[PDB]
Design a protein around this ligand. Structure first.
Ligand SMILES: Nc1ncnc2c1ncn2[C@@H]1O[C@H](COP(=O)(O)OP(=O)(O)O)[C@@H](O)[C@H]1O
Ligand SMILES: Nc1ncnc2c1ncn2[C@@H]1O[C@H](COP(=O)(O)OP(=O)(O)O)[C@@H](O)[C@H]1O
Ligand SMILES: Nc1ncnc2c1ncn2[C@@H]1O[C@H](COP(=O)(O)OP(=O)(O)O)[C@@H](O)[C@H]1O
Ligand SMILES: [Mg+2]
Ligand SMILES: [Mg+2]
Ligand SMILES: [Mg+2]
Lengths: 520, 514, 180
């Protein structure tokens, strides 16, 4: 009949596996006896529509060439050397084996660093089809595994929809916000090399081969990703950008794209490098370039309005007239303390938004039985415990360094981290709290440009802390000249690029007794 | 086929139309399948493909339309004019995602209608604050009985254009965020799939006007990919101008009257603004005006009078006794109480901080904190208490009040939940004024986060706080120095009589207030 | 005479009677009743369902009621039990094109889109039904709706409603109602 011939013509060019062919044959035989007006006829027709639309034997012709792919990758993005190295290794492995292959990757980092744009660029370089869907906040398993034919509203799920859309068995599938998933049990089957080749969808009732599909996941923090799901995929860190990198991105990518978006041209609107530097250092505060893009778009919108209105035939943006386009600076103040009085020590922080600088303030609550420490600043339970440990160690250290100084054992002290409205957690501020307490007790301020991080033990040992790269970037942004780090983080600090640490006087410590000598 | 004559149909919809028509050509009319196929094909043929509304791109006519339709709203008007300029440079229609956030009743919904009129686009509005499901914006599949293609397909159908203006109302109260990401994002808005019909429609040209009351409760991804445009409140004179030019004429026209039958004097509107209403918007003012004009219409029709002039002498005959009989809680502040400013989803408001002795004397002193304060606000109060004690140790070492006396601190809005560190400096001022037995300047307001060493940190909502302060008749205001950008974004007539002080450390505030 | 019949039909609710009297006044001055539709809301048993029948007597219009819970658009014309929407038989039995329509307890609606068709002046005169292939002009009909609560009503419906509250009764008013 016409329907059977249509479905078979849909099926001519595919190299269908034997079991799928048997299923299609039996469903066609079933359709050959049902009446056209039957609802079961509708169900069978809808089923055969999906089975005859899966690209059982079609593969996209990849560009297995290192030079062209490297050119595309380095022309589409700046500074993503880890991701580019991984993709070049993928291409080399595909070329050496002489066949297409699939892998499961995961890009994690602060928002606005380019995790999705790099995935689109990778799909462009590999000549693979591109598809993406978001699992953030997802609570329904049935949108991946599908619903069986019995129910009226059954759908074969996102993976089968992607396979039908892309018409290839080796596309690039981006799963966005895997760390914000509510449902993960379907993903465990979806991306697992032992069972990718036999992924069974409830609607299809027939397995599809997903071994050649290149899965790329996106997240911001790895710890929130489910534990059995974090083990299947490979973690690649897409870290934030330093001011120089952001300036390079703005000059090379952001401004040229926003000019085309606004319809302007280079001769019509010119963005000086000083303007971009000012926008970076005073109109944005982030690890990515997400807000810088919006500021550039605002500047070019104002320029376009000026051109159309006839106020000027061409407009040049200058740090003298930048306020005409974006107003007054948003971040005029970079550091809370230019010079720190006794009792406050500057530290470093790391969050899902990247690295940041924090201060630890201490003061007396009562003039001149026991003493006590009050802690405020929306600090978490871990950081409250860190403050208790730091207070105990400060008492112990001051007992032996200055026996006559009964300040810590008798005085009542309040400790605050001035970012009162922002929740804070982590034990990395223990050494900073110890230093703040000791500086308050001795009445001596610490080195005026020193920053520090590191967990402290009850006996004073300094323990490694995470987020060294983001903390170093924040220190460089804040004008820190000397940074104190745990010795176990030496392997993490020297992995940094030279332009991130060219001006830092770095000290690596094992115990607080030498942090005391460094800071005092 | 006759319905598709002029449409520029996508290449992937004629196959669906042809198969639906071929199926229809063989089914019997009385079958339910025939009826559902008729409905589906009617939906596919009524939905316009490829046609666009003739958006007028005259920066002069649209500027005039926007200025005549609404008072103020300079930022929104500038945004729309520059959008028109960008569209002119591009040479083709375009769409963007805009968000109007501000106190309720300030015109965020009506300014979108004015924008739609100015752009010659079609307009639609739907609310998402009461939405907790996902199927409403995408409908139900044709197999379900009584299925409909959601709301969006209905809009694009009845507007008969591919680039309408869609207002997304009450976004800040999502109960479905990811469903809004897949629509309010230019990376995927170019292909949006409905569930009744699986055809992905192109909505990149659609101008989405988001509407919300406060940004901080909007989910992080949604607020990040849409532009924040602030629609601030109005001072009394702006309210009077809006009422005289827009509210009164509209309420008169909808009631069927004219200027000869009912007249509203400036004094009556001033009384309604100052007493019968207390808000940043004009919604309650509009309701009062409609009530007055409706009672005037009743008087006219009943034959009580041929014409009525509303005057402050007979205003109670229309709106009854005045509500909000007092403009401010304290006219002259006792020593222990200091004026403050607050910002909420309903707009700015003025709060007070009351302190008094809890024990008869004048071991150490203590601070009790009541007034439905939040945890962050309790921490701010503790920091303020510690800093006030430290400051009094150095300003007046003989003053043992703060270090020995037991103090109770209350915020007289005892039933309303309040939170935020912006009242730290107010709390410090209240504690010091109670300790010294001195009242602050009688017409002084202040706000700002305080640190343990006394530094003043920037706070949000400076615009609404200043509007509320001007409403409360304050003459001197203290703000953090980092909020100078936000303060001067206000119109010059708002900050006319306000003596403005920008501070970085509490010593300046102490020198100003005392 | 509208005021007289409102007084004779219901005791108390002097503020409510004043509000409806204002409604007739403004409708008469406008020359037509088309506009915002009245929405009486309040506790159960407070006279909301009857207040509208009293209004219908006051305006000398015919009265009708149907409670929501599509019945608005009926069924397609076939041999299989064809029966169109509720509004048409209202015209059948009221024998006029301008009866008063009471929409009872809008909160319990399951057909919101079909209901909104009647409330839009730009299409209320072009009402279409499944059984009737001909449009019907509902320009002259008058709508009043009632609800126990206003928050849970459909959002596209709420903005079209002009909320009128019924404040309940006091012991003396309840005694008068019981006696009379
Ligand atoms: N290193 C880079 N080189 C070029 N463009 C970049 C770079 N980093 C970010 N961008 C730009 O910033 C934008 C980031 O958006 P997106 O990648 O969707 O956010 P996220 O990184 O949070 O997923 C992209 O449009 C991209 O063009
Ligand atoms: N600046 C203004 N100029 C003219 N009319 C205004 C202005 N602000 C508010 N209005 C009027 O107030 C009425 C209600 O405003 P609304 O759109 O509900 O505000 P919101 O969208 O913030 O709730 C509108 O009909 C509008 O005409
Ligand atoms: N003010 C009143 N005067 C006379 N009868 C009343 C009054 N209020 C309520 N009733 C009586 O209460 C009965 C039921 O009220 P009903 O209208 O069903 O309440 P609801 O407003 O909840 O629908 C009616 O039959 C009516 O006669
Ligand atoms: Mg992304
Ligand atoms: Mg509104
Ligand atoms: Mg009832």
């Amino acid at each position: 009949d016409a329907i059977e011939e249509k479905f078979r013509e849909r099926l001519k060019e595919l190299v269908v596996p034997k079991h799928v062919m048997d299923v299609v044959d039996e469903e066609l035989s079933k359709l050959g006896l049902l009446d056209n007006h039957s609802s079961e006829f509708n169900v069978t027709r809808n089923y055969l529509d999906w089975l005859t639309s899966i690209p059982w034997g079609k593969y996209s012709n990849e560009n297995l060439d290192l030079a062209r792919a490297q050119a595309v990758l380095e022309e589409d993005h700046y500074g993503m050397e880890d991701v580019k190295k991984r993709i070049l290794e993928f291409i080399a492995v595909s070329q050496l084996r002489g066949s297409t292959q699939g892998k499961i990757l995961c890009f994690y980092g602060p928002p606005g660093v380019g995790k999705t744009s790099i995935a689109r660029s990778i799909a462009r370089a590999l000549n693979r089809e591109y598809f993406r869907f978001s699992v953030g906040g997802m609570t329904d398993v049935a949108e991946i595994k599908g619903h069986r034919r019995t129910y009226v509203g059954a759908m074969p799920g996102k993976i089968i929809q992607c396979l039908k859309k892309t018409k290839t068995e080796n596309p690039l599938i981006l799963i966005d916000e895997v760390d914000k998933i509510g449902p993960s049990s379907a993903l465990l089957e979806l991306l697992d090399p032992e069972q990718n080749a036999n992924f069974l969808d409830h609607y299809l009732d027939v397995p599809v081969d997903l071994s050649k599909v290149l899965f790329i996941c996106t997240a911001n923090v790895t710890d929130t990703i489910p534990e059995p799901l974090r083990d299947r995929m490979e973690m690649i860190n897409v870290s934030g950008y330093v001011a120089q990198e952001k300036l390079a991105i703005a000059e090379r990518y952001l401004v040229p794209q926003a000019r085309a978006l606004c319809g302007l041209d280079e001769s019509k609107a010119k963005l000086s490098s000083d303007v971009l530097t000012l926008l970076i250092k005073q109109y944005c505060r982030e690890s990515g370039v997400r807000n810088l893009q919006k500021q550039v778009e605002k500047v070019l919108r104002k320029s376009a309005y000026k051109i159309v209105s006839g106020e000027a035939e061409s407009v040049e943006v200058t740090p003298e007239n930048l306020q005409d386009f974006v107003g007054k600076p948003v971040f005029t103040v970079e550091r809370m303390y230019d010079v720190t009085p006794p009792g406050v020590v500057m530290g470093l922080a790391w969050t899902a938004m990247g690295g940041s600088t924090l201060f630890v303030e201490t003061s007396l609550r009562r003039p001149q039985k026991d003493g006590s420490l009050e802690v405020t600043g929306q600090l978490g339970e871990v950081m409250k415990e860190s403050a208790r440990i730091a207070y105990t160690f400060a008492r112990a250290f001051l007992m032996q360094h200055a026996p006559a100084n009964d300040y810590l054992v008798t005085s009542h002290i309040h400790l605050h981290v001035p970012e009162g409205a922002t929740p804070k957690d982590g034990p990395s501020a223990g050494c900073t709290i110890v230093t703040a307490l000791l500086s308050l007790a001795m009445g001596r301020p610490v080195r005026q440009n020193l920053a520090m991080t590191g967990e402290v033990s009850l006996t004073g040992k300094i323990l490694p802390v995470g987020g060294i790269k983001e903390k170093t970037i924040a220190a460089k942004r804040a004008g820190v000249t000397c940074i104190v780090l745990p010795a176990e983080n030496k392997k993490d600090f020297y992995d940094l690029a030279a332009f991130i640490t060219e001006g830092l006087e770095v000290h690596f410590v094992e115990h607080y007794r030498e942090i005391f000598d460094i800071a005092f």
